[PDB]
């Protein structure tokens, strides 16, 4: 009756999830653990291996920029792609496209980055991150070696990733979890909160049922994810703070317009 509908919803969200996001967590873990028969990644652990694998595992390449800014700029454009993938997914959530268009923008403005970090964990282990649709692996250590402005820019996403990955969620749990984040009825500037809260409540129930059936032995996996949602806010907060340090302490800082609009806050 109501639960059968909560399972149908969970499966719709998963089917749309697999459409919007090519590199699933299942595939990413298959590569990180070494379980794929379809090739293997190129490791970038120092400045020399970056050069050899620069044109490799890549997303007019003559930038003449410092390695730190080129990496950072590489991050910008995977985020640009991800913002588009998240938007395609958010529009597949039943009832989203019927929201006030300006409320949709607000939900995406304050939600994309929370979801990018969540899904970024699926590509991360304690040693690095899968990059370029699984073609490359960038060591966490190599990212800290960067200059002091950009050296503590990815470590935060690593700390959260290792902890979030301890929960052992799959693509089904993440599909609903992402939908709940997007449908937050407490995003600043929303004009019609109640219709957003009604959707999230129905999503939270599908998530709770999803977790009980999928992780029947992991008691309190729901209350743990509700806390992670709160963490993701402070994590993005500290992230936006760092960006303004760069924008203020760094020159020659080209930023993609889509991120300028999202970051305007």
């Amino acid at each position: 009756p109501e639960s059968a509908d909560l399972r149908a919803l969970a499966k719709h969200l998963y089917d749309s999830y697999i459409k919007s996001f090519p590199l699933t967590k299942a595939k990413a873990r298959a590569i990180l653990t070494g379980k794929t028969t379809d090739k293997s990644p190129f490791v970038i652990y120092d400045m020399n291996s970056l050069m050899m694998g620069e044109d490799k595992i890549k997303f007019l390449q003559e930038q003449s920029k410092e390695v730190a800014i080129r990496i950072f700029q590489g991050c910008q454009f995977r985020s640009v792609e991800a913002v588009q993938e998240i938007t395609e997914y958010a529009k597949s959530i039943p009832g989203f496209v019927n929201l006030d268009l300006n409320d949709q923008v607000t939900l995406l403005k304050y939600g994309v980055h929370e979801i990018i970090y969540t899904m970024l964990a699926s590509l991360m282990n304690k040693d690095g991150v899968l990059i370029s649709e699984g073609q490359g692996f960038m060591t966490r250590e190599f990212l800290k070696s960067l200059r002091k402005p950009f050296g503590d820019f990815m470590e935060p996403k690593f700390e959260f990733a290792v902890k979030f990955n301890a929960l052992e969620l799959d693509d089904s749990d993440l599909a609903i979890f992402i939908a709940v984040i997007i449908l937050s009825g407490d995003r600043p500037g929303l004009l019609n909160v109640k219709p957003i809260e009604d959707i999230q409540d129905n999503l939270l129930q599908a998530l709770e049922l999803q977790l009980k059936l999928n992780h029947p032995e992991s008691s309190q996996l729901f209350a743990k994810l509700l806390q992670k949602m709160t963490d993701l806010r402070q994590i993005v907060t500290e992230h936006v703070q760092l960006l303004q340090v760069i924008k203020k302490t760094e020159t020659d800082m080209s930023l993609h317009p889509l991120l300028q609009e999202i970051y305007k806050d």
Partner: peptide
């Protein structure tokens, strides 16, 4: 001027 809005309106 909203890029996010143009993304939201595309099919």
């Amino acid at each position: 001027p909203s890029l996010l809005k143009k993304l939201l309106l595309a099919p």
